Amino acid sequence: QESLSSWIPENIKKKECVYFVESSKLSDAGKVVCQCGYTHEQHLEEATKPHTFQGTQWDPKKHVQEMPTDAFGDIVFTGLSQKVKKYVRVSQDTPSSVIYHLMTQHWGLDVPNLLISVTGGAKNFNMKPRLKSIFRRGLVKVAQTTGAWIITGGSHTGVMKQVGEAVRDFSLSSSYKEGELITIGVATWGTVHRREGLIHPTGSFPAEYILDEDGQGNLTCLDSNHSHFILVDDGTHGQYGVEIPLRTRLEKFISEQTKERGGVAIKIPIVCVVLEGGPGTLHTIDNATTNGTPCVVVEGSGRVADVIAQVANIPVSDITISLIQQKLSVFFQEMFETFTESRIVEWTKKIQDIVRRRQLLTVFREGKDGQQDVDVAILQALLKASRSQDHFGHENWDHQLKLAVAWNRVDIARSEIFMDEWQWKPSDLHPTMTAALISNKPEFVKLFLENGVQLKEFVTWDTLLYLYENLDPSCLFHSKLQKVLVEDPERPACAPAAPRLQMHHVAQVLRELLGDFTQPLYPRPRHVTFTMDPIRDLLIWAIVQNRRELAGIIWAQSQDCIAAALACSKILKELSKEEEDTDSSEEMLALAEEYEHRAIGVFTECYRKDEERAQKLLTRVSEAWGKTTCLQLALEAKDMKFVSHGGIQAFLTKVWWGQLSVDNGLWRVTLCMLAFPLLLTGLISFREKRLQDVGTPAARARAFFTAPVVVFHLNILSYFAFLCLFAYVLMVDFQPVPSWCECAIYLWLFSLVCEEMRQLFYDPDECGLMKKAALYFSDFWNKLDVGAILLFVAGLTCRLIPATLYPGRVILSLDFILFCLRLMHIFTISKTLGPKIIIVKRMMKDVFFFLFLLAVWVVSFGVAKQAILIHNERRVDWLFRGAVYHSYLTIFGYLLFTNILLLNLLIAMFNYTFQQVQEHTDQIWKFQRHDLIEEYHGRPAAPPPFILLSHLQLFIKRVVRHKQLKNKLEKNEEAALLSWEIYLKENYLQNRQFQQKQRPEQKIEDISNKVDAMVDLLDLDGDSYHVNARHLLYPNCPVTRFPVPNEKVPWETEFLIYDPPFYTAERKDAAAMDPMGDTLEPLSTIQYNVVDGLRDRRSFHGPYTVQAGLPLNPMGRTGLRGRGSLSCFGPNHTLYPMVTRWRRNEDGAICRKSIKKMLEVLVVKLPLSEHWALPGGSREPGEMLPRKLKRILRQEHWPSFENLLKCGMEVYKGYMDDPRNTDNAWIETVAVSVHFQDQNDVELNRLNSNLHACDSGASIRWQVVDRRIPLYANHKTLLQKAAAEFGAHY
């Protein structure tokens, strides 16, 4: 609103009538109306001055002045909706660039993918409800699902009133994006009812407007359902012909613009629709159709549109002028008598053209055939005309696909594009596949992947780099990627001005998210080159920015799908906690829980086909995911439902024992560990019976110390025996000379901390030392283990000086109590009491306050016990013992409060947090098992009493991870394992979809969807005369040629209205022929049917009719008589040479289409023409035509040789249809075709060396012969005739 009010008045300007002509005609009791028609005695309301020289009368040029616009703002239509709609006020001469810039940037509109235009008559009309609902629904759907502009008129009467009505109908529901059907309106400012309440300079912000129908004259009121208005000025009061020219110019300039989103660029398609127009719609339809807009006329309730619908598929030129007159005399009752005999001619000619081209013209057929929702009909006509456009190199296919992907309708893609036009090698769909992936279009990616594009290909290094650059610019990954991009300093070292994206940048942040333990996925830098597993990277690109539907589609064809499915959950959980959101932070946390279930469901499929091979893939280092296993990812990703599957627990129980069998029990293990000579007999069990039957006595002894459960039992027994020994010395061995167990308690308490060196020091994955310390501090059990030494802190001095008996016993006794509390951790192994200790560790909290609930009142009643005794006494020492005894007696025995009031408080505080923990404790404990299992696997194989032998032996190895949970497999076997995994994943996905389609809700939805199409089903139930030479608007000539219908085109035919303007060339004198544009002076002396020297007067057609000294066109009356663009008065001779050879494959043989050969023809275009033409021109020299014909092509020396070789085959000679043909001058052509039989040598190499076209102009190029080859309309008729020369397929 600040930079908008500035960019309006000093570039846009308004017309005004400065001069003061009085009123030639006074109308409707008004004298202020003067020609143009504003107020005041003068023509306008400006200063009443002589206004420079007082030249009589005014000229719309001399006396129209352009001054800056003063009216603009946000119109509000009183109480009829509060929406605030923009409006600007312009004039005739404003370039469309200014309006486009304003409308795109300042107004805030977005560039559309389609420009639908609504032009129609303004006489109010009323139409049947069926067609009415069809039009409304079709227009709204086609204009909402594509985000198209609906540019139309701004009046409140007619078709534009109908479209305002349809926009209101859309706003009635407005399921989402209510203010998205933006409809810019174009109307004349000079004819508005309440326009004086809008003229406010330097900002008419919310300028209220009042609409009142049946209160005007011929002027018009504004609409209320449009979104934007652009009003045009002319300094006129009652004219209606000023908005159409500017609208056509702007609408033409819009289609020139190109939209580039996702890597594919298209020029905006442009479509037109009409509904019962009047006299000016036969302007707009012609003006649109001649350009190439797919005009869509609707059959039904039509004054004009119904005329085209009626005369629509009846073939061209089969209609007579009288037939058109009788067609028109049955529909126009009001003015059937005011139709001039010349008004028929214009309509006949324009209907002739429009209905002649049926490729551009399209009739709706409201209910007969093709009676769809109108949206697909409009799109179908648009793609018809797009297919009809020029294309040389298979461009129609790619353009139509690009446009379909630009829109969001897959039905169009599959029913028009992907069904037809052949070919489409799967590599061809790659460029648009990138845009489909970038714009998040899952339907189109499914369709493309159906047609043959393989995800194994199309993921190149370049393509991946392109995709990461165009990542969604609203993502946490985008922000962090930008940060790492800018923070790397020796990357800008080469060029600090521009930051360059590379592959390692995404890899670093990916490692940051996924974990330290993995190596970077993409190696540091140090044609098409795929990386290993080209699907994992596309899977990352799809997962990171939270693309649900793309994610499953890409994961459906992954190499390894347990590791990938778990990494996808780890990344999501890591990136779903520091996002600072509540919508996507909740969406990703739920998508992670779904990839969790994907990983779980794929693995149980493998665990049911086999047992031993279902764990070798559980523990195998993956080279495509950071050199990590499938178990460490789940354990570190907090996957609570995967590590407690049962197939994971069996594998953990198996390593909990080792190489020995599990179906033995715990009692037998204790019996054997207690009795050392109890393993050589048949008591303990074994698996892998090769060592059980042939039992090695040496291996049997080593196996138990290898097993970790034996190590755990030795540790627990050693710790318990230590604790008993400490109790023993607490009892009786307490001598000032250190008892035989003082050094022993020191050393065997060091036995705990020396292993703590191993637990704390070891870092299987690269982790910081301070992180290690923080992790150690975060453990409350480790805090108790440290608190053992913490209560040592007061014990060593008490031992050193043993006199402090009374203070010092308590320190060591509480140290014993803390030792016993630490002993309680042993039950985590116990399956039945492990989770039970887990819940008790959360039970511990309630005691801290139930103690304040119990002890305080117990002590209070103990106080009352002494208060009962005696009142006043002074014995601090004695009352202490007395109160202690009383409290002890009360505790031992009070019954009213202990058993009744407190007990249920306790039981309830228990049971509240007991309830609802049955489900989660199992998962928690089965998760916590692995840490202890791995710790005891990493522990040494010696009892704590003796473990010093290994503590003194693990130093020489260092001076000069294990294969149980992480190992490398052999590649040949790994390939078979991966193929087995692929087969089982396919089976699992297939079963999953088959079983999910059977849900009752899905079945009900299927019935509901099936009944709707069925409800829809039940509810629904050539003359050969010249044509180009007869078009209106003679090229580059302001005067328009008089319309001549095909009925009276020949000279001999009856005709009575002949009045064409005398055609005048720009410079007829320099033609070197008769300059007589007007035949007043017959200076020309043309020797008819004879040679006249410099100017040829001999025609190939033959003796033509001559009258009044003006040569008559033999073909017929073109409609314009005069000098013409042709050089000479009368016929002009030319020759068009063509070089034709059979198009050849790599073998050199003639190439075949389905029908016949291909001809290869050389064509040349110059940039200014914007069309292709044969290298032929007017034969200025009589002796040597080719020199002037193709002087810019050959050499004139090489073309002297070409003239020596100029002896070929004569294809066509006779009259030519050319747009310059006036009634006086016409063009006749000679066609010579030189053909090449072999391509080894001769004239081909002669022309190759015979080239001087490099002097100037554009390129000279060979071409194929095709129906859509870009050439002039009838200049290619010569080539079409030449097709018969050598059996050509068109």
Ligand X SMILES: Nc1ncnc2c1nc(Br)n2[C@H](O)[C@H](O)[C@H](O)CCOP(=O)(O)OP(=O)(O)OC[C@@H]1O[C@@H](O)[C@@H](O)[C@@H]1O
Between 518 and 1229, name the residue whose CB sits nearer to ligand X.
Answer: 1229
- Backbone angles phi and psi of 1272, in degrees to 5: -65, 155
Half-sphere exposure of 337 (CA within 13 A, CB side): 1
Phi-psi bin for 308: left (phi > 0), alpha (psi -120 to 50), beta? alpha
Which position among 18, 33, 71, 122 is part of the footprint of ligand X (CB under 6 A)? 122
Among residues 120 and 626, whose Cβ is nearest to ligand X?
120
Among 1272, 1280, 1285, 1286, interactor with ligand X by CB under 6 A:
1272
CB of 154 to ligand X, least distance (A): 7
Question: Both tokens of residue 264?
Answer: 């594919």
Report DSSP letters for 832-886, one per residue. Answer: TTHHHHHHHHHHHHHHHHHHHHHHHHHHHHHHHHHHHH-S----HHHHHHHHHHH
Binding ligand X (rule: CB under 6 A), the pick from 78, 1040, 1169, 1245 is: 1169
Tell me the helix, strand and coil percentages in the chain, rounded to 5: 45, 10, 45
Choose between 188 and 584: whose C-beta lies nearer to its own copies: 584
Question: 220 or 887: whose CB is closer to ligand X?
Answer: 220
Among 9, 73, 112, 121, binds ligand X (CB under 6 A): 121
CA-nearest of 138, 144, 582 to 378 is 138
Q: Would the annotation count 664 as a binding residue?
A: no
> Does 967 appear as a known binding residue?
no
Q: Considering only residues 148-167, where is the footprint of ligand X by CB under 6 A?
A: 153, 155, 157
Give me the least distance between CB of 344 and ligand X, in Å please: 17
Of 172 and 419, the one with the shorter C-beta distance to its own copies is 172
759 is in an annotated binding site: yes
Confirm or deny that 408 is annotated as ligand binding.
Answer: no
Least distance between its own copies and beta carbon 604 (Å)? 10
Pairing mode, strands 228-232 and 85-90: parallel
CB of 557 to its own copies, least distance (A): 12
Contacting ligand X within 1107-1126 (CB under 6 A): none
How many residues touch ligand X under the rule CB under 6 A: the total is 29
In the three-class reduction of DSSP (H, G, I as helix; E, B as strand; rest coil), residue 295 is classed as: strand
Kindly state the smallest distance separating residue 582's Cβ from its own copies, in Å. Answer: 4
Q: Which does 591 bind (CB under 5 to 8 A by kind): its own copies, ligand X, none?
A: none
- Partner interacting with residue 1177 (select from its own copies, ligand X, none; CB below 5-8 Å by kind): ligand X
Chosen from ligand X, its own copies, none, partner binding at 822 (C-beta under 5 to 8 Å by type): none
Is 332 a binding residue for ligand X by CB under 6 A? The answer is no
Residue 216: closest CA among 242, 195, 244, 243: 195
- Which two tokens mark 430? 């790659």
Q: Minimum CB separation from ligand X for residue 281, in Å?
A: 5
Listed residue (418, 412, 401) closest to 377, CA to CA: 412
Closer Cβ to ligand X, 246 or 812, answer by number: 246
Say what the alpha-carbon torsion angle 381, 387, 388, 389 is, to the nearest 10 degrees: 120
Q: In a 10 Å sphere around its CB, with 0-12 CB exposed, 13-18 middle and 19+ buried, how is residue 1085 labelled?
A: exposed
- Residue 1168: which of ligand X, its own copies, none does it interact with, CB under 5 to 8 A by kind? ligand X
124 is in an annotated binding site: yes
Which of 8, 148, 244, 933 is the binder for ligand X (CB under 6 A)?
244
> Does the protein bind ligand X through residue 746 (CB under 6 A)?
no
**11 labeled part of a ligand binding site:** no
**What is the token pair recorded at 1200?**
């002297």
The candidate with the shortest Cα–Cα distance to 724, out of 810, 819, 789, 615, is 819
According to the annotation, is 1152 in a ligand binding site?
no
HEC readout, 412-435: HHHHHHCCCCCCCCHHHHHHHHHH
For residues 1174 to 1193, the per-residue mask of contacts with ligand X, x marking binding by CB under 6 A and - elsewhere, is: ---xx---------------
First vs last C-alpha separation in the chain: 59
For the bound state, the minimum distance from the C-beta of residue 1275 to ligand X, rounded and expressed in Å, comes to 4
What DSSP string describes 182-226?
Answer: --EEEEETTS-TT-TTS--SS-EEEEE----TTS-SS---B-SS-
d(CA 1198, CA 1249): 8
Three-class SS state of 1229: strand
Residue 1131 · residue 1099 · CB < 8 Å: yes
1220 annotated as belonging to a binding site for a ligand: yes
CA-to-CA distance for 602 and 181, rounded, in angstroms? 47
Q: How far apart are CA 1178 and CA 1185, in angstroms?
A: 8
Distance CA 487, CA 66 (A): 55
CA 1254 to chain centre: 44
| Shortest Cβ 594–its own copies spacing (Å) | 21
Known binder of ligand: residue 119? Answer: yes
Nearest approach in angstroms of CB 604 to ligand X is 50
Nearest distance from C-beta of residue 1067 to ligand X, angstroms: 12
How near is the Cβ of 301 to ligand X at its closest, in Å?
12
**For binding to its own copies (CB under 8 A), which residues are involved?**
582-583, 608-609
Q: Is 1280 in the site for ligand X (CB under 6 A)?
A: no
The option from its own copies, ligand X, none interacting with 153 (CB < 5 to 8 A, set by class) reads ligand X
Which bin fits 452, alpha (ψ -120 to 50), beta or left (φ > 0)?
left
Told to check if 1035 binds ligand X by CB under 6 A, we report: yes
Q: Within 13 Å and on the Cβ side, how many CA atoms surround 379?
A: 29
Residue 82, annotated as binding a ligand: no
User: From the CB of 608, what's the least distance to its own copies, in Å?
Assistant: 4
Which residue is associated with the tokens 């449009």?
226
Q: 1272 among the known binding-site residues?
A: yes
For residues 1173 and 1184, which CB has a smaller minimum distance to ligand X in the complex? 1173
Q: Is 1196 marked as binding a ligand?
A: no
In the bound state with ligand X, the residue whose beta carbon lies nearer, of 862 and 1177, is: 1177
Span near ligand X by CB under 6 A; candidates 135-143, 272-280, 1044-1052, 1154-1162: 272-280
Q: Which is nearer to ligand X, 289 or 751 (CB)?
A: 289
Q: Name the binder of 524 from ligand X, its own copies, none, CB < 5-8 A by kind.
A: none
Helix (H, G, I), strand (E, B) or coil at 153: strand
Is 449 part of any known ligand binding site? no
Query: Which of 924, 940, 315 has its CA nearest to residue 639?
Result: 924
- Contact call for residue 1275 and ligand X (CB under 6 A): yes
Binding span for ligand X by CB under 6 A among 277-285, 585-593, 721-729, 732-740: 277-285
Q: What residues contact 532, with CB distance under 8 A and at least 6 apart?
A: 623, 624
Q: Does 1221 bind ligand X (CB under 6 A)?
A: no
- Neighbouring CB atoms inside 10 A of 987's CB total 14
Q: Per CB under 6 A, does 281 bind ligand X?
A: yes
**Smallest distance from the beta carbon of 1008 to ligand X, in angstroms?**
43
Report the nearest approach of its own copies to the CB of residue 587 (Å). 12
Compute the distance between CA of residue 982 and CA of residue 564 in angstroms, rounded to an integer: 13
CB 219 within 8 A of CB 191: yes
608 binds, among ligand X, its own copies, none (CB under 5 to 8 A by kind): its own copies
- Cβ–Cβ contacts within 10 Å for residue 566, how many? 29
Q: How far apart are CA 69 and CA 233, in angstroms?
A: 10
How far, in Å, CA of 574 to CA of 596, rounded? 14
Binding residues for Ca(2+), by number, are 756, 759, 782, 935
Binding residues, by number, are 119, 124, 247, 278, 281, 756, 759, 782, 935, 1168-1169, 1218, 1220, 1272, 1274
Binding residues for ADP-D-ribose, by number, are 119, 124, 247, 278, 281, 1168-1169, 1218, 1220, 1272, 1274
In the complex, the residues that contact ligand X under the rule CB under 6 A are: 119-123, 153, 155, 157, 218, 220, 240, 243-244, 277-281, 284, 1035, 1168-1169, 1173, 1177-1178, 1218-1219, 1272, 1275
